[PDB]
Each structure stands twice: as structure tokens, then as C-alpha cells.
Amino acid sequence: LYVSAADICGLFTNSSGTQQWRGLARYFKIRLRKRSVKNPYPISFLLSDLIN
């Protein structure tokens, strides 16, 4: 599972009048299931591959 996120909260802008990045966590609560699928693929491809 590949996970991606981007979330510009900003820079914490220092007492200075300087800025510095700030980051935050992401949460996930995934609810998942199985889909049954066809192979169309094969051995044939193996063999050629094998061969390769």
C-alpha cells in the first residue's frame, strides 16, 4: 500500500520574523475488502520470460 499525502500547514514563523516549516501527521482508518479476479495471464508468459 502506497501512501501519499501533502498538507501545507505553513512555516512556523518564529519570534524572529523567520519562518521555519511546520509539519503534521496523517491518520488513516481504512475499511477494506477482497475482489476476486480473473487471471488472463500465465505461464506462457512465464516461459518466455523464463527463457528471457
Next chain:
Amino acid sequence: PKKPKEPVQVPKLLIKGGVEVLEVKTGVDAITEVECFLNPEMGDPDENLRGFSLKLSAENDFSSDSPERKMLPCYSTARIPLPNLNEDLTCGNLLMWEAVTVQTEVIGITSMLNLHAGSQKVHEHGGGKPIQGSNFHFFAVGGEPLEMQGVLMNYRSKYPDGTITPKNPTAQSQVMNTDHKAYLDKNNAYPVECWVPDPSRNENARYFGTFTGGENVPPVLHVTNTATTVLLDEQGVGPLCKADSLYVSAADICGLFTNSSGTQQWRGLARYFKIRLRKRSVKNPYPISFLLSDLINRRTQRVDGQPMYGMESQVEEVRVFDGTERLPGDPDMIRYIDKQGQLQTKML
């Protein structure tokens, strides 16, 4: 007249154009026209001796020979990646490409009609001496990334290898050397003079070339474009680029351009090829086991410790029990199988 005459139930091109076409879905015979070509590899000194070699030495000795690349053509090769028929394919019939026509042609001479531009003034108030010499136009087409077979004279030479020569330097390297067996698996590396078919192995490539020795030897062409040569045989086959990757192979010595200094150097030129491809179906020809051994064990560890394996064996015996039968009164027999029948031998 003009007329709605029954206008031939000609085949169906579907598209054409280059590489994009490969990606295609399935349509049985499927067959194709390849209009390719290769540029030459001469040892190509540069951008002008781009398609021509470097020049050459003249009265020498084995001993007095170190090559360097530039004069050295090596054969031009390629894997052309070819479509996969088998990406899905899951049937007990197997499809492969079986190779149907080429009409290939060494292409685009026409500048070489310069008897000019440095073509060594033969004399007279006539012209130069352009190119020419021996020419070898050859190609081989393999299904395989083939068996070469190196051929050397001169194992008193000092050979390069980018221009990957054959190795080995026996006397017998000067005749056949059953060790200079190689394999072209390399663009411009088998320098041509160095390498030869291992044709005993070359069986899944077809080559045709006709090497044409001789001093200036004329190029007599033909420029037909109207009758291919067909890549079938008795069993209707040519190379088998089983490899849906293509092993492409060639040499095209036009001869030598003779500079005004007689700086003679091979000139080579590009060949165009025009190939006709089909899908041929086979059987299985190889079993599961033979395959299986791979995955399994490959995505795995090794176990070998105190030695058993091979022959280094704290292993002990390998014999054949089996059955339950009356009483052969030799039963501590030495029970064999001659292989096809049972050998029964002892000392007792």
C-alpha cells in the same frame, strides 16, 4: 471505362507505421512488414568515416599486427524487442512468431559515384579511384543471440576487444579452434575478420551473405523491390526469434575508399531490411518440473553442510526395493536394472 468490378478481397492492413503498432491485441496469423535498416559499424573513425572505416596496412606479418578499433568493423547486431503474444496466453497451444519474408537491401549508395573528392586520380584527364574492392554483404538474422565462432590467423597479433575478438591463440587458432566458439551478443564487437559462424549451432539463424573477394570487385546490383526472399524452409522456418526480441546481424563492406594517397579504408553502408512476420502455434515442448525448480527454490536459501551432495557422500545407498513377491532365493541380490530390464549380478 472505369467499373464496379469485383475489387479483390484483398487482405487487411489495419494500420501500419512503426513501433506503435507492436502493442497490439490479437488477430491470429498476424503479420507484418518491417521496414528497418541498420547503420554500419566500421571501426567508424568518425563522423566522416561514418559508415567508413579507418585505413589499413599493407605488407605486414602476424607479428607486426596490433589492431586498434577504427579500421575494425564488427558486425552490427540488435535485439529488436518483439511483441509478446504470450502475455496472457494461457492455452495449451502456444504462439510464437514464425518468420516469413525478408527483402532487405543494402541501401543508399549514390554519393559513391564520386570519382572526385579525393578519389585517387587514376590518371588521365579522366578521374579518380573511388571506393571498391571486395565487398561482403552479408547478414544473418538470428532468432538467437547466436553462435559465433572466432577465426584468427595471427596469434602473434595484439588485438583489441571492444571490437571483441575471439580469444584463444593456439596454432590451431589459425585453423579451427573449437574454443573460439563464441556468440554474438554484442554490437560492433565481433570484428568481422575475426569471427565466423559457429554454424553448428547456427541453426536458428539464417544468413546469407556473399562475400565477394577481389581487388576492386564490381558491385552489380539489382533493384527490384518486387520479390522478397522468404524465411521458410522445409519446415517453413527461418531463424526462430523465439526471442520476441530480434537478433539482427550483418556485414557490408562496400570496398575501400582509396584516398588520393591510396588511403584505403573500408567503406561500409547501411542495410534496409523488409521483414514478414507470422504467428506460428506450437505444442508444449517443455515441462513444469523443469520450470518449477526455479521459482520455488530461487526465492529461497541453500542447505548443504557436512557433505552429501554430489558424491561427497555420507549418503549411503541407492537401490530398489519395491514389490512383495514370493521368494527369489537370492534376495540380498544386487538388484539392477540394466536400464531396460533387470540386471541381476553379484560375486556370491
